[PDB]
Structure 1
């Protein structure tokens, strides 16, 4: 019946075909369906069956249109490779003299189904006299909404396009969903001609496409962007305008803005997000504060501006430049020619238990690198706000293996630097503070203090504290009460980690206070010693 070879399909091991009862349907709904299945049978899409067929699926009606529910069949159907969920990004596309888009929607139903598996798709047309035997059928082609259809259809398209592609090297085809997107750098007449050749080639296999009178118009709306065959733009983003905002409204908005932060610089949600505190219900009406009214306002302005883009030229350099927009926050733009970006983005404030700015820069760099490999199969040359000396100093001695691909320095404030650097050896002439902190773990009552070789001492009692905290507070006190250079001895295990990693940011607000003190000193030497020893 059909030219294309079928793909052998199976039900997950052990499981069996669907057995769902057919809902009762009104008389006009049954008629509509009775007619659609007379035509579908005629066209060859389905076959009249009804004897030894146990399986069944519910048919529906939404001129009427039928809808079969294969959720159950899908639950019983084997697994397939996967119909890739990773779709291309405009930044990776190439500028083409011509691009045509062929909707191959009905091509779905033009691909045969493993006859061996067709029994499973059986469904039934109800009756008025609920009693009478229903009209039974089954599918001969890939059912709309069935599990295997996307995968099998595309595999089929792949084998059918093989020859054409071989005979036409200068032509790029992209298949996705039920859309063939054909592009090239041939003269428009020659391109139009080759499209027609492709259409008749597909048609030779039973696949239909709309004529030149029906094919879709470039610019094409494709997942947020507007594609022109010579550049791309961003479909303008529209922010509502209401007198009453509910939590849903505010979360939806914050959602939209956050997506825009990527392409647009300066979008902010801090004040809008504040509206979400202690909210008791989704439908709750929160009034915008002045600042949220304002913030909302400036964002509307920013989004008015048109953000255009450019395509990828493989004969040109790929460059990535990075900015630290605030602590933990990073912005980047990848381009080829100065000021003509291919892509831009930012990474949400990276927050953790303890790290440093240089380490974070390093991570931003690798996220970019993974994204670039995917988009361009190449790695950008990097222009980073950090001096070579700074990198060489930090990396060369950090405890963890780290790297940054070829890069060059770009002096664009604020630069990424080392906020402090613990001394390598004890400091001659600096007061030496022996610190200690202890707390009852259960009563959460403790004491933190020190004694210095110069005779300075202090102790403070704390309540609702932990042991870890008294120890760290001991260190905090020493830093507060000492001169510009200080030596500090501690048996705290967490200080041992500070010595190794020398973090400039942390979760612990106490550690953060210590860090601020550490940064303030001219010289600090931190020394760890085993606890409960004959030391101190």
Structure 2
């Protein structure tokens, strides 16, 4: 019963995360960049109704806030089944083009897995839920990611923007990976024998025995919850001799 021993560490019982040790992120623009305001293609009522609940939840969570900004990018209505179940997808390409590039430090999965000794079996896989949203954005950088929002009848101001690292931003994966590495540096030091692989929001903890793995997992969960991150109890693979990680099936003294 891990879900009961670590309420704060699971997305299902700890609530939306927030990396309390990480200073709000400032996003540097290229030297010649100037704000770009792209028109919002009219959205059908169907798409708008499908997206609305997600927008309201984000507003309730403080992840989205009203704003007036010289920047504006289009929101897209993306479905999955056939025409049901929507979710907001922002096209941040014009913003991405104006943000200064950073070095891509996230290792490719092939290389990351090479750091797994055959001696370390007993794997634990955790995926952090709404990872990017756990990282706050400095108020000065928030206007950059604004988009327009119109509600059927009674509609909010006009524009809304993110107060957390957003989806669709070219540097989110890298900034998150680096931030979590900083937050988990001490854990690595306090658990010299454990193996910890990080691929943005996908974590793999490897141990020598089932005991060390259960001990390590308890410690990692406690630490993650403490720092403000949240793992998915639903998808969590705890102390298994076999697990799925980054598209691979780790089994028998390997990976």
TM-score computed with the length of structure 2 as normaliser:
0.79
Name which structure has the greater RCO, CA cutoff 8 Å, separation 6+: 2
Residues of 2 paired with 1:101 and 1:126: CA distance?
40
1:204 paired with 2:222, answer no
Q: Is the 8 A contact 1:48 1:136 kept in 2?
A: yes
Query: Is 2:235 the partner of 1:191?
Result: no
1:36 partnered with 2:54: yes
User: Which deviations, in whole Å up to 9, do the C-alpha atoms of 1:478-527 show, x marking residues without a partner?
Assistant: xxxxxxxxxxxxxxxxxxxxxxxxxxxxxxxxxxxxxxxxxxxxxxxxxx
**Structure 1 residues 145 and 230, CA, compared in 2 at 3 Å: closer, same or farther?**
same
Q: Distance in 2 between matches of 1:66 and 1:189?
A: 43
1:63-462 alignment, distance < 5 Å? 63-89=85-111, 93-95=116-118, 96-126=120-150, 135-185=158-208, 187-211=209-233, 214-216=235-237, 218-220=242-244, 222-223=246-247, 225-231=248-254
Q: Deviations over 1:40-87 (max 9, x none)?
A: 01112111113xx12111112223211111011101111112134544
Cα shift at 1:127: 5.5
SS of corresponding position for 2:54: helix
Please state whether the residue corresponding to 1:28 is helix, strand or coil.
helix
Residues 1:204 and 1:229: Cα distance change in structure 2 (over 3 Å): farther
The alignment partner of 1:56 has SS state of: coil
Mapped to 1, the partners of 2:121 and 2:245 lie a distance apart of 18
Structure 1 Cα separation of the partners of residues 215 and 42 of structure 2: 52
Q: Per-residue deviation at 1:221?
A: 5.4
How many aligned positions are there?
Answer: 225
Q: What is the rounded CA distance, in whole Å, between the counterparts of 2:156 and 2:70 in structure 1?
A: 14
Q: Equivalents in 2 of 1:214, 1:221: separation in Å?
A: 11
Greater share of strand: 1
Q: 1:124 touches 1:137 (CA, 8 Å); kept in 2?
A: yes
Residue aligned with 1:76, SS: coil
Question: Using the alignment, how far apart are the partners of 1:206 and 1:30 within structure 2?
Answer: 32
After superposition, the Cα gap between the structure-2 partners of 1:80 and 1:166, relative to the gap in structure 1 and judged at 3 Å, is same
- Where does structure 2 lack aligned partners over 5 or more consecutive residues? 1-17, 79-84
Contact 1:26–1:128 (8 Å) recurs in 2: no
- Of 72-81 and 202-211, more deviation after overlay is shown by 202-211
> 1:168 and 1:221, CA in 2 relative to 1: closer, same or farther beyond 3 A?
closer
Deviating 4+ runs (over 2 angstroms): 31-35, 83-93, 126-129, 132-135, 216-223
Displacement after TM superposition at 1:201 (Å): 1.0
Structure 1, gaps ≥5 residues long: 233-536
